[PDB]
């Protein structure tokens, strides 16, 4: 179930991040967006099966 | 096991908090998966109705005024000025003004535009957003490349099988750049262009125009490059408008557009001054003032 | 597990022990008059012997603005480093002093930014005083640059934050040196990756006020052609030693120094 | 305090740079405090299984033994397990770093790309990038199972 | 185990830059703190006092200065730890005497009819209260009974005479009298007979009179010396313009206190624009006489922040004079009408005296 959840999940917010307007990344900090991408993803990959 | 309730308590209690903790990782994942924007399609037939491929880009420019929020300020304020098809057009405008309002009717990226706006003739709405870019140039200041192969890096999205590519960057500039690449065609991009030039994304930008078939051109500051480039930049120009019929401009460098078709200068919010030929340019010393 | 954990501490001890007793620059004795003041020089990086340079016979109190040019890679940056102590020394009698050392202002080639705001990126751990900081700011042009930047001088500039680009670097790092109220400056090469002659002679202007006022040395290290020569004292060198430190009238009886 | 008094030779500083500095002062000093977390372990659970051993002969008898042998002959294989995991993880954190460092390039010059229309090529290469990563992460997954 | 225990001690990530957490410190709530509240009663917490005990060693003020609740349970457990504990005496020492075990014998007891504990309990109820029912007498057997029977009359007689005193200095209190003393809620600064001063208004409630009242007001504000010296709070003695300079006041009506603003003040340069929450300003009001009744001496603390302030404002009159004798309309005690005043500061209404009226 986690490993599964894991795939699903990163390939829709790659799906969703790739396809918004170029004017949300200039304004957004992209640090947040980064954060969530790396930090939030490892935990939701390695941290939440076990 | 009432010996055991003592710690299960204490690890349901931890097991908790660190669950709590986590699923705040997977709320921000889903705030970000919330972002329902950049809606991609097409309002319209775009099998024949729009044109297949742009030519001319004549901007029948209906009153077309940007605005990205639309509540705070405009970018726009009626920018209507017709392109010139079978020339040139190095319009030095302000980036205050010129380079919001070029961007939003070319490319449909800012699309809260008060009215119309059309590129090519007909309406930019009525075609696939992806599609709409897919056969048009632009070229862009700060260098953003990446690391991979440069047959796999000029026509990625098509996955050209001309041979050209390698003449693209052989030819049009960096030519010492083949004898630097052990590779040649196939060869790899070291670390997002270390130490190849500033432009090498311009050899790049000239291959995708030329194979697909971008008539139009964009263009943007050169924040600083040996003016053998831009020369080169001129010649590619004069092949595009000659050929293709349509090359736009757009810095602060009045001398560059000055040697060029058309003109146009915008300030504080629009577009300040038009003009069909580069004569009223040296005779409104406006410009040139600005310049030097 | 108990028995991983204590097993990978026995492979950090050995890293940490290995990294403990790494080179150091206290040899030579470093950790136990003119400011540039060295007889001989026999510098080096290697511990023991192979030296990168020596021959430096330069003798300079204070008050005296001194530009060293040379050709690249012919000890301009490895003097400027030696000059505040960190090259190994092997046979060379050097005596700095001052009016014990002093607060010996610096800066390198390589652009390091503090991944803090920019204003504190300026001032360093400096009281924050506006007079000094507007006019220093205002002669090395990064106010231009602070008209796109959104929080201006409230971004996270450099790495962990903004991402920027070399000549606003360039323009960071030697605001900072001259904020800094020393009464020694040892730039080198603010010239080299940004040469525009007119924020770089605005900065030199204000540079003429301040370190002029307080008689403080500006050793600038670079190779622009418009103060190449200079009606103050200047220095030459070249495969690792020095010819003569003074008048450029020496330089024009060469004949081969001459622009 | 060591690094103020460290020189700055190509031969030395060349060599250990900033990452790896940054490394050592997370990996190996948390490593290590971890250790000083779990010495009263080495020091106990040695006497705790010692003590619990003899009196479950003493409460049962013999098949006690047997059975709590039975554990003890379990341990090599597990201790197996958990390095094989940790040597899956450090595989897969690689190559999770070496994904994330294109997505960093890639939601760099995200104006440069739309412009371009470089979305379809990039956003399929990392899709690829995850395929890998996540057959590295499905054998983690099988590990840390057969840990519970 | 059932926690989650792995192999996981690197913690080696690289996180991007965060900026902006949503975190509620936005604004601070807290205001001003005031130094005494509206009620007496200081807002001012000491710490890091180091203790030697001199809470402790003056029971006598701890014990007045308890409540009535839990002086009665301390004066109940006094009596009933000595009553107690001397039961134990008396039952003991009966019961070593061996006049405990009943029986037709020669053993005659030391104290009387004692057969069980709470015959030894009830005993000591009758000694030390003086009760002294006699059905459980004390005999000339055993000198010891005699000596206890000294002692617990002297130890019940030392408690009844300590709680005696500790009642009387209770029953004294006059802090339930200086509870009855009322300053207006909100204090003004309007101008009188042409010279700006801080007015407020004092009443007294009950028909006992305070004898000997004494209107003291300080002025509380952070200073910064030209030598530059830091007092957080400094305290400036202020006058109360009474027609003899001193604080002494005769109070029945609710009289209006005001500080007249003189150049020797240190109100003299404050404007209304410069009046709002944040304004690191107190005023605090002493009424300290003593009560005809008790004879004990009493204060009255209100303080005055700077919202507190009501500028350019009058109190209403309040007396009238009825057909018997005078009135006061206490509902109107509080209650302030606007005045035609001047905005400027006194310093500038000062300056404006100074030209004005030398005309010539
Ligand atoms: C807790 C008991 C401690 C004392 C036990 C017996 C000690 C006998 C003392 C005889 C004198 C010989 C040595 C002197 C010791 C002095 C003790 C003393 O003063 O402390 C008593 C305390 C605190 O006072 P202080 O601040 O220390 O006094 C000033 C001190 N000299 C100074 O250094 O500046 O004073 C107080 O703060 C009040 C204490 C009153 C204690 C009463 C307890 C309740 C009794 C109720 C039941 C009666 C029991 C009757 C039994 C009879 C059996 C026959
Ligand atoms: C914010 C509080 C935090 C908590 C701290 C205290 C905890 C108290 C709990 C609250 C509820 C208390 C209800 C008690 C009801 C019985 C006591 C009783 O009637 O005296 C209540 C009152 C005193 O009240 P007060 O408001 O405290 O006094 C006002 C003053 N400002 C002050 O506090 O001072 O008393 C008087 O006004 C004096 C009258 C004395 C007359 C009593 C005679 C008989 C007393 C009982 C003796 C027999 C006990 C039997 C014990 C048997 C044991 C075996
Ligand atoms: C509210 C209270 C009032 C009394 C309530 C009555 C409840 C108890 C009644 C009772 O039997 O008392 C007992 C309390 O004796 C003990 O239990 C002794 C305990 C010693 C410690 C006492 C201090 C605490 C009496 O026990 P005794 O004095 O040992 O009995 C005498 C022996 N004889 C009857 C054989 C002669
Ligand atoms: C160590 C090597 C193993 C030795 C085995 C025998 C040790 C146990 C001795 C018995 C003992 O201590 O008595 C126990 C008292 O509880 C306790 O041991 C409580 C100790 C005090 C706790 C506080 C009750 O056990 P028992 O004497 O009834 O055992 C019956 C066995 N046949
Ligand atoms: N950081 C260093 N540590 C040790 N030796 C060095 C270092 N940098 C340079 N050297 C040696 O000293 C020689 C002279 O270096 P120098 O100080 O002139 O360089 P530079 O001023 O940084 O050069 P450039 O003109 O490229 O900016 C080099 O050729 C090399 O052999
Ligand atoms: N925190 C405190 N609590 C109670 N009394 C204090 C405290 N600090 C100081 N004092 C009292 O103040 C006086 C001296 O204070 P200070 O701390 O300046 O000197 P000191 O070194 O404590 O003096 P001494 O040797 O006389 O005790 C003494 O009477 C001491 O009891």
């Known amino acids: 179930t986690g490993l599964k959840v894991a795939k699903r999940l990163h390939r829709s917010l790659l799906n969703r991040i790739i396809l918004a307007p170029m004017r949300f990344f200039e304004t957004t900090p992209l640090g947040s967006i980064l954060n969530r991408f790396s930090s939030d993803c490892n935990t939701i990959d390695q941290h939440i099966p076990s | 096991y009432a010996l055991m309730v003592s710690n299960y308590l204490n690890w349901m209690v931890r097991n908790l908090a660190d669950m709590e903790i986590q699923l705040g990782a997977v709320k921000r994942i889903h705030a970000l998966l919330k972002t329902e924007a950049e809606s991609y399609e097409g309002l319209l037939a775009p099998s024949l109705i729009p044109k297949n491929w742009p030519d001319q880009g004549k901007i029948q420019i209906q009153n077309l005024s940007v605005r990205y929020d639309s509540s705070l300020k405009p970018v726009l304020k009626h920018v209507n000025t017709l392109i010139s098809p079978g020339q040139k057009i190095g319009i030095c405008g302000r980036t205050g003004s010129g380079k919001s309002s070029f961007s939003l009717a070319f490319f449909r990226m800012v699309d809260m535009f008060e009215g119309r706006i059309i590129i090519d003739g007909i309406d930019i709405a009525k075609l696939p957003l992806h599609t709409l870019r897919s056969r048009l140039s632009i070229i862009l200041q700060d260098p953003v490349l990446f690391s991979g192969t440069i047959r796999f890096n000029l026509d990625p999205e098509k996955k050209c099988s001309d041979s050209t590519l390698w003449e693209a960057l052989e030819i049009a500039q960096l030519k010492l750049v083949v004898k630097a690449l052990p590779g040649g065609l196939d060869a790899i991009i070291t670390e997002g262009g270390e130490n190849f030039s500033q432009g090498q994304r311009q050899l790049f930008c000239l291959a995708r125009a030329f194979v697909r078939k971008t008539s139009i051109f964009i263009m943007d500051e050169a924040t600083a490059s040996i003016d053998m480039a831009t020369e080169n930049i001129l010649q590619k120009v004069v092949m595009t408008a000659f050929a293709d019929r349509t090359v736009v401009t757009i810095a602060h460098r009045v001398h560059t557009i000055l040697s060029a078709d058309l003109v146009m200068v915008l300030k504080r919010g629009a577009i300040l001054e038009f003009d069909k030929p580069e004569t009223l340019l040296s005779q409104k010393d406006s410009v040139f003032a600005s310049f030097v | ?259 | 305090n060591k690094i103020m008094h460290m020189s700055t030779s190509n031969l030395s500083m060349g060599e250990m740079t900033a990452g790896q500095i940054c490394n050592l002062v997370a990996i190996d000093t948390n490593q290590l405090m971890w250790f000083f977390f779990l010495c009263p372990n080495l020091w106990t659970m040695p006497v705790q299984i010692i003590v619990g051993v003899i009196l479950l002969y003493y409460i049962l008898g013999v098949s006690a033994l047997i059975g709590a042998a039975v554990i003890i002959l379990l341990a090599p294989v597990q201790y197996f397990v958990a390095t094989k995991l940790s040597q899956a993880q450090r595989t897969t954190l690689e190559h999770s770093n070496e994904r994330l460092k294109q997505t960093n390039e890639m939601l760099r010059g995200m104006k440069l790309l739309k412009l371009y229309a470089w979305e379809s090529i990039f956003c399929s290469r990392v899709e690829v990038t995850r395929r890998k990563e996540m057959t590295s992460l499905r054998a983690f997954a099988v590990y840390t199972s057969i840990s519970i | ?360």
């Open chain 5, 1 to 360: 185990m059932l926690s989650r225990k792995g192999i996981i001690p690197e913690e080696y990530v690289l996180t991007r830059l965060a900026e902006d957490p949503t975190e509620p410190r936005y604004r601070t709530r807290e205001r001003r703190a005031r130094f005494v509240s509206k009620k007496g009663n200081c807002n001012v917490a000491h710490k890091n006092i180091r203790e030697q005990g001199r809470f402790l060693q003056d029971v006598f003020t701890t014990l007045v200065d308890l409540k009535w609740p839990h002086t009665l349970l301390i004066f109940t457990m006094s009596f009933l730890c000595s009553w107690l504990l001397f039961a134990m005496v008396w039952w003991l020492i009966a019961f070593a005497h061996g006049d405990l075990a009943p029986g037709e014998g020669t053993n005659v007891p030391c104290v009387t009819s004692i057969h069980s504990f709470s015959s030894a309990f009830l005993f000591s109820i009758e000694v030390q209260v003086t009760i002294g029912f006699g059905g459980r007498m004390v005999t000339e057997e055993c000198p010891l009974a005699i000596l206890i029977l000294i002692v617990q009359n002297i130890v019940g007689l030392m408690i009844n005479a300590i709680m005696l005193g500790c009642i009387f200095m209770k029953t004294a209190q006059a802090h339930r009298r200086a509870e009855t003393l009322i300053f207006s809620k909100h204090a003004v600064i309007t101008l009188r007979h042409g010279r700006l001063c801080f007015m407020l208004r004092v009443g007294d409630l009950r028909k006992s009179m305070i004898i000997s009242a004494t209107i003291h007001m300080q002025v509380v504000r952070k200073t910064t010396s030209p030598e530059g010296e830091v007092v957080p709070l400094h305290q400036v003695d202020i006058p109360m313009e009474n027609g003899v300079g001193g604080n002494s006041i005769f109070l029945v009506a609710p009289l209006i206190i005001y500080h007249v603003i003189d150049s020797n003040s240190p109100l003299y340069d404050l404007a209304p624009s410069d009046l709002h929450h944040h304004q690191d300003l107190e005023i605090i009001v002493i009424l300290e006489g003593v009560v005809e009744t008790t004879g004990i001496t009493t204060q009255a603390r209100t303080s005055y922040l700077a919202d507190e302030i009501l500028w350019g404002q009058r109190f209403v009159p309040i007396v009238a004079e009825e057909d018997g004798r005078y009135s006061v309309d206490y509902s109107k005690f509080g209650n302030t009408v606007k005045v035609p005043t001047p905005l400027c500061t006194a310093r500038q209404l000062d300056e404006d005296r100074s030209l004005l009226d030398a005309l010539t």
């Open chain 3, 1 to 259: 597990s108990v028995v991983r954990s204590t097993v990978k501490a026995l492979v950090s001890v050995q890293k940490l022990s290995e990294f403990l007793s790494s080179a150091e620059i206290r040899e030579e004795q470093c950790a136990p008059n003119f400011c540039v003041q060295i007889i001989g020089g026999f510098f080096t990086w290697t511990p023991d012997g192979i030296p990168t340079l020596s021959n430096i016979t330069i003798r300079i109190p204070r008050g005296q603005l001194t530009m060293i040019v040379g050709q690249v890679g012919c000890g301009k940056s490895s003097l400027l480093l030696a000059t505040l102590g960190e090259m190994q020394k092997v046979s060379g009698a050097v005596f700095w002093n001052s009016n014990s050392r002093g607060p010996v202002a610096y800066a390198s080639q390589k652009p390091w930014l503090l991944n803090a705001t920019v204003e504190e990126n300026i001032t360093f751990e400096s009281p924050f005083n506006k007079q000094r900081y507007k006019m220093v700011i205002e002669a090395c042009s990064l106010q231009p640059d602070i008209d796109i930047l959104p929080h201006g001088d409230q971004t996270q500039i450099g790495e962990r934050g903004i991402n920027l680009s070399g000549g606003q670097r360039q323009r960071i790092s030697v605001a900072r040196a001259l904020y800094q109220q020393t009464n020694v400056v040892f730039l080198d090469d603010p010239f080299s990756a940004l040469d525009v002659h007119l924020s770089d002679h605005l900065m030199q202007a204000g540079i003429l006020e301040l370190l002029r006022d307080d008689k403080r040395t500006v050793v600038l290290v670079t190779h622009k052609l418009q103060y190449l020569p200079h009606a103050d004292w200047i220095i030459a060198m070249k495969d690792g030693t020095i010819q003569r430190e003074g008048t450029l009238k020496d330089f024009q009886r060469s004949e081969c120094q001459l622009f």
